[PDB]
């Protein structure tokens, strides 16, 4: 893995463009994250 | 150490839970290609993954993260879409599930957008689609996602497309 950028613990990626897109996050350190949640789903087919 | 909790349906728990994964479906840009087409899900099964070494793994790094940030975590709830879910609830996060070519660099990344990480549960792009069918829009099979905690701390703001 990388390192995060100097002074920093995360990045977060801000979209730009997609003006519905949510942000998604990075974190170069795995004790930094933990899996609280298994959801078990399948998605549905649109009527 | 992991041990897994079913949580009912009529639990509060279980209930918020769903409406984060339903509630932050959008449309992407491939048109489904990586992940299917989809406006909703149909959820069969919430667990708690309890593993008392990997909250403890975490607790700790949460306190240096927040002691070097105003004593701010910055601790979200985020998706996490992968074909490693059975080894990272096992084992927990770490190098084997980066992301050695993603766009702000090899390391672990989360989505708000649940249909965002759905488009990882099969590998980077949808990979080939399900193991059963070889689809990425497949309706049959089930497919799982983690929702983390995540300690964000002092996050680089990086603007994208
Ligand atoms: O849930 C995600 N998983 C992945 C993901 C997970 C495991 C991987 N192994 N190799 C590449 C991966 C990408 N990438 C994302 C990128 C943006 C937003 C969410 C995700
Ligand atoms: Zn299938």
């Given at each position: 893995?990388?390192?995060?950028?100097?002074?920093?613990?995360?990045?977060?990626?801000?979209?730009?463009?997609?003006?519905?897109?949510?942000?998604?996050?990075?974190?170069?350190?795995?004790?930094?994250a933990?899996?609280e949640?298994?959801?078990?789903?399948?998605?549905m087919?649109?009527? | 150490?992991?041990?897994?909790?079913?949580?009912?349906?009529?639990?509060?728990?279980?209930?918020?839970?769903?409406?984060?994964?339903?509630?932050?479906?959008?449309?992407?840009?491939?048109?489904?290609?990586?992940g299917?087409?989809?406006?909703?899900?149909?959820?069969?099964?919430?667990?708690?993954?309890?593993?008392?070494?990997?909250?403890?793994?975490?607790?700790?790094?949460?306190?240096?993260?927040?002691?070097?940030?105003?004593?701010?975590?910055?601790?979200?709830?985020?998706?996490?879409?992968?074909?490693?879910?059975?080894?990272?609830?096992?084992?927990?996060?770490?190098?084997?599930?980066?992301?050695?070519?993603?766009?702000?660099?090899?390391?672990?990344?989360?989505?708000?957008?649940?249909?965002?990480?759905?488009?990882?549960?099969?590998?980077?792009?949808?990979?080939?689609?399900?193991?059963?069918?070889?689809?990425?829009?497949?309706?049959?099979?089930?497919?799982?996602?983690?929702?983390?905690?995540?300690?964000?701390?002092?996050?680089?703001?990086?603007?994208?497309?």
């Open positions: 893995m990388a390192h995060s950028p100097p002074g920093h613990h995360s990045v977060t990626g801000r979209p730009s463009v997609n003006g519905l897109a949510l942000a998604e996050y990075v974190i170069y350190r795995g004790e930094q933990y899996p949640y298994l959801i078990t789903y399948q998605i087919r649109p009527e | 150490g992991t041990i897994l909790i079913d949580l009912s349906p009529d639990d509060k728990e279980f209930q918020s839970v769903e409406e984060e994964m339903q509630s932050t479906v959008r449309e992407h840009r491939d048109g489904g290609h990586a299917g087409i989809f406006n909703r899900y149909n959820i069969l099964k919430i667990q708690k993954v309890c593993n008392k070494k990997l909250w403890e793994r975490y607790t700790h790094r949460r306190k240096e993260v927040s002691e070097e940030n105003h004593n701010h975590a910055n601790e979200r709830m985020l998706f996490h879409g992968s074909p490693f879910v059975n080894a990272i609830i096992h084992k927990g996060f770490d190098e084997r599930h980066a992301y050695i070519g993603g766009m702000f660099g090899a390391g672990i990344y989360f989505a708000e957008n649940s249909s965002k990480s759905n488009q990882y549960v099969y590998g980077i792009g949808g990979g080939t689609g399900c193991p059963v069918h070889k689809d990425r829009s497949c309706y049959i099979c089930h497919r799982q996602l983690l929702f983390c905690r995540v300690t964000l701390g002092k996050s680089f703001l990086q603007f994208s497309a």
